[PDB]
Symmetry: C3
Subunit: 144 residues, 3 copies
C-alpha cells in the first residue's frame, strides 16, 4: 500500500548511489513513470554562441554498478528548439567513475546563442547493463 | 517449419505494438536477420541547407514495453556520404510515449544541402532494456 | 588464483571474436576494470579541418553475438578538448557484420583542425544485448 514496499514487479530493480556535490540542486528524477532517463541539472550559468561547446558541471557523482553503464543523452526539446547537443553523445559513464558528471554541451544552431541557467535540466542519464566482453582474437571468422 | 511458429531460440523475444499513423509508408523492418535496428521512414520531403535542422515526422507511434527504451540512431551511410545526423542522438523514446516518433535531422556538411524524400529510410530504431534505477542519496561513496 | 580461471562472477560474461585486419595496432582494451568500452585505434593519419568529416579505418573486424549490438561512442576527452565527434554516434554494429569497423569522425571545432595519428585511440566500442522486437501492427493502442 505505501511506497516504502518494493512492489513485486520491481523486486529486482537496481539502486544507484548518488552524491549531490552541489546540494542546491534537486535530485535527478524521472519526468514520468517508466521514463528511461533521470534529468541532470546544470550547476552553472553558461552562454554558448553558435558552434561553441562547454563542459558543464551537473553537481552530481554516481556509482554505476559493476556490469553496468551510465549513458548521458541530449533532451529532445532543447535539441529541436535551439539546437543544443552533446559533443560526446552518448556520454559513457563507467562503473568505476566517482568523479563529477560533466556534460559537454554544444550549440549546433547557426546564429542564435543558447543560455543555460543553473537549475536547468540539460541532459538525461540512463543506466543499462553492458557486456564486459572478453576479446578472442582469431585469424579468421571461419575458426571462431 | 512455417514462420508463424516461434522458434525455440526466440521464445522470449519481445513484441512492439505499432500504429502506422501514415499508412502510406511500409512497416519499419530490419535490413537483415539479427540487425539491431528497424529503419524508420520519413513521412515528408525536407531540404536541409548546411547547418540547418528539422523535426521530421516518421508516420509511426510505438509502445516501448515498461522496463525498456526505444533508441533512435543515425544511419551510417547517410552520415558519411552527406553528413546527415540527429541532433539529440541517441533519441530517447520512453515506455510511456504514445505520440508520433519524430527525428531531429541535422545537416553537418559545410556546403551541400541534403534532400530527404517521403519514403526514405532516415534513422534506425532500437529497443533495449533499461534499469529504472532507484537513486540512493549518500553523503559519501564510503557509506554506499 | 591465475587469470585463465573464469571467476564465478564472470562465468556468464560473453566473448567477442575479433580479427586484427591491421596487426600493427594493439588489441582494443578496457582502460580500467569495469569500463563499458574497449578503445578502438585509428589505423590511419587524418587531418580534419573545422567542420570536415572522415571515415577512419580501425583495423579491426568483430563478430557481435546474435541477440547483441556493438556501439561506437565518442571519447569524452577529445570531444571536450578539440571538439572531436562521430557523425552517426552511437555507431550501430550489427551482429551479422564481418566488415572492418569504421569511425565517421567529425571536427565540431569552429577554427582549429584536429590531427589524428595511426595508433591514437579515437572511439570506444561497447557491446549490449538488444531486443530483436517483433512488430505487431495495431490500429490503436486500445487494442494492444
Ligand atoms: O528522437 C526522439 C526523441 C524523443 N521523442 C519523444 C519520445 C520521448 O518519450 C519524448 C521525450 O523525449 P526527451 O525526454 O528526450 N525530451 P524532453 O526532455 O525535451 O521532453 P519531456 O519533458 O517530454 O521529457 O519525446 C521523439 O519522438 N523522438
Ligand atoms: O560506426 C559504424 C556504424 C556502422 N558500421 C557498419 C557496421 C554495421 O552493421 C553496418 C551498417 O550500419 P548502419 O545500418 O548504421 N548503416 P546503413 O543503414 O547506411 O547501411 P545498411 O543498409 O548496410 O544497413 O555498417 C560501422 O563500420 N561503423
Ligand atoms: O558525458 C560524460 C562522459 C564521461 N564522463 C566521465 C565518466 C567516464 O567514466 C569518464 C571517461 O569517459 P571516456 O572514457 O568517454 N573519456 P576518455 O576516454 O577521454 O578518458 P579516460 O582515458 O579517462 O577513459 O569520463 C563524464 O563525466 N561525462
Ligand atoms: Mg525528458
Ligand atoms: Mg542499416
Ligand atoms: Mg575512455
Amino acid at each position: 500500500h505505501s511506497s516504502g514496499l518494493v512492489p513485486r514487479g520491481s523486486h529486482m530493480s537496481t539502486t544507484l548511489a548518488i552524491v549531490r556535490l552541489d546540494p542546491g540542486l534537486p535530485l535527478p528524477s524521472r519526468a514520468h513513470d517508466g521514463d528511461a532517463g533521470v534529468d541532470l541539472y546544470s550547476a552553472e550559468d553558461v552562454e554558448l554562441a553558435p558552434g561553441r561547446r562547454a563542459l558543464v558541471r551537473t553537481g552530481v557523482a554516481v556509482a554505476v554498478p559493476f556490469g553496468m553503464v551510465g549513458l548521458v543523452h541530449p533532451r529532445s526539446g532543447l535539441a529541436t528548439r535551439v539546437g543544443l547537443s552533446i559533443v560526446n553523445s552518448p556520454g559513457t559513464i563507467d562503473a568505476g567513475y566517482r568523479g563529477e558528471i560533466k556534460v559537454a554541451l554544444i550549440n549546433l544552431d547557426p546564429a542564435a546563442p543558447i543560455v543555460v541557467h543553473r537549475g536547468d535540466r540539460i541532459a538525461q542519464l540512463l543506466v543499462q547493463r553492458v557486456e564486459l566482453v572478453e576479446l578472442v582474437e582469431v585469424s579468421s571468422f571461419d575458426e571462431a
